[PDB]
Symmetry: C12
Subunit: 65 residues, 12 copies
């Protein structure tokens, strides 16, 4: 499965997993402080990922700066 | 499954998931504030995605803005 | 499955799904207003997609405008 | 399955599906007026596609102008 | 399955499908007027395609004219 | 399955299918007149193809003339 | 399965595995001192990886520093 | 299955199929006169191909001139 | 399965295999003298590899030193 | 299965097939005259090929002469 | 399965196979004298390979000199 | 399966097959005299290949000499 790389560029960045299925809700919010990184897959339970806060992101489709 | 990357360039960008199957209706609306990102897959339940609001988008076919 | 990216360049763009199978009818018309984007897969129920109105389109085979 | 992209360059363009199987006949004719686009797959029921009228076409093998 | 793109450069171009199997005979003749295009697959029933008339052809191996 | 493209450069070109199996015989001879094109697969019944006469040939391994 | 390469650029770097499944908790924290490298897969039990501390990271999508 | 392209550059070229299996013998010799082409697969019954006489050959590994 | 190449640049480089599964602990420590190389796979039993000591490392994602 | 192309540059080039399995012995010797070519697969019965005599050889790894 | 190429650059080079499984031990040491080459796969029984002594090594990830 | 190409550059080159399995012994030594070529697969019975004597070797990972 595909994954995304998220580096926080400030404190309090939020990486949020949305549930896979007919129901869509937030199931987890991971806090990243400045400089911390989360490398997160799409999975059986996560089919969309939301990022709140200033972050540098890499995916297969390129960079978000 | 393929995914799309949506960066909101204004508050209130709406990412709308349309139901897979014989019938087509929206099943989820996810709102993004300016600078927020949604990385969203096509899934068993979502076979089309509509984006309303000023956004920067990446897919396998490149950039749409 | 393949997907197409359609950005409306004017109000009232229509993205129309044609039924997969022996019969061919329109099963859904998605109206896009100017600047809205639809990212739509080919699916069990949709084997052809018609676009009416001024639009910018990306597929695996390139850009249409 | 492969698909083709057809943009009408004049009114009254006709995209015609030919039946898959031992029998070959037209099963559907889709009319495109100037500037309209059809993105159409090969399918269980369609193994050849005929285009009548002035059109710009993209397939995996390139462009017809 | 592979497909071929045939653009007629004169009226009456004939695209001829030859039967798959131990026996070989034509099972279908599709005529194209000048400027018309046929996009045709190899299939369960068609294992060779003959083109008669002045035409521009694309296949996986490139252009034949 | 692989296919070959044969364009006759003179009248009376012969494209001959050889039988797949322990035995090898000619099962079909397709006559091409000048400018005609045959696009022919390897198949359950054809494992070698012989061409007699002046022709332009494309395969996956390049051009023969 | 995909893997990530993490080189600690200071003492006390923490590479944290998050549990695969409906629930998300930290199941392991691997402490890296300066110059140590961890090469870690995504696995049945780990579907997201968090990195705290100054580190140089390689994944399939590029370098993070 | 792989195939080879053989063009005779003189009369009396011989393309010979060797039997697949524990037994190795010639099962077929196809005569090519100057300019004639044989496009021949490896098959259930042919696991080596011998060419006698002046010929131009293409395979996946390049050209023999 | 992927593998990593580790060249020790000093005596006593430690290549440490971490257990695949719900639990994480080291199951093997392999020491390398200066100039020695270990080429090590990810496996049923090893889902993360830790390297301690000055080393030159190659993986699919490039060089880490 | 892979194949090799062997062009003899002298009379009496010997292409020798070695048996697949626990035991290794030659099971077939095919002789080539100057200019003759053998295109030979690896097979159920042949897992190594020895060439004796001056020859030009192509394989997936390039040219050996 | 992947393989590695090891050329000894001095006498007494040691290529050592480590056992696949929960248990890790040396199961074989192959001695290479100057200029000798071992081409060795990863296998059911070998999931890590250790090289002692001055050697030139090629793997899919590049060269160790 | 992968294969290697070995050209002897002197008389008495030895290409030695090592047994696949828990045990490792030499099961075959193929002597090559100067200029002879052996093209040898990895197989059910051979999981490592040793070369003694001056030789030119090609594998998927490049050339050894
Ligand atoms: N529960 C939704 C989540 C989702 C994925 N992609 C989306 C795009 C738009 C809206 C919601 C989604 C699903 O699995 O389909
Ligand atoms: N329910 C439709 C949604 C859809 C996907 N692609 C489309 C293209 C056009 C219109 C609707 C659609 C389907 O699954 O097929
Ligand atoms: N119902 C048709 C729709 C279609 C797909 N491709 C086409 C091309 C031409 C005409 C119709 C079509 C089918 O599934 O086959
Ligand atoms: N019914 C035919 C349609 C067709 C496909 N490709 C063709 C080429 C030539 C003529 C007819 C065809 C088939 O499925 O085989
Ligand atoms: N009936 C033949 C048609 C054919 C395909 N390729 C050919 C090449 C030569 C002659 C005939 C053919 C077959 O299926 O095999
Ligand atoms: N009947 C033969 C035809 C053939 C294919 N490739 C060949 C090469 C040489 C001679 C004959 C052949 C076969 O199926 O194997
Ligand atoms: N338990 C979650 C962990 C996870 C993976 N990717 C994520 C993205 C965001 C939040 C949590 C996650 C899962 O397996 O799905
Ligand atoms: N009957 C042999 C033919 C063959 C293929 N490749 C070869 C190489 C050398 C000698 C004989 C062969 C086989 O199937 O294995
Ligand atoms: N036992 C863990 C080991 C592991 C792999 N990748 C990791 C990343 C972070 C922490 C631990 C790990 C697992 O198999 O999942
Ligand atoms: N009978 C041996 C032949 C062989 C293949 N590759 C080799 C390399 C070295 C020595 C012998 C071989 C086998 O099938 O395994
Ligand atoms: N027995 C171990 C050997 C091993 C492979 N890769 C490793 C990395 C580090 C330590 C040991 C290993 C295993 O199969 O998993
Ligand atoms: N019998 C061993 C042979 C072997 C393969 N690769 C090796 C590397 C090192 C030592 C021995 C080997 C095996 O099949 O695994």
């Amino acid at each position: 499965s595909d994954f995304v790389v998220i580096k926080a560029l400030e404190d309090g960045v939020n990486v949020i997993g949305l549930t896979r299925g007919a129901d869509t809700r937030f199931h987890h919010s991971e806090k990243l402080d400045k400089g911390e990184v989360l490398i997160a897959q799409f999975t059986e339970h996560t089919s969309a990922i939301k990022v709140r806060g200033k972050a540098y992101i890499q995916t297969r489709h390129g960079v978000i700066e």
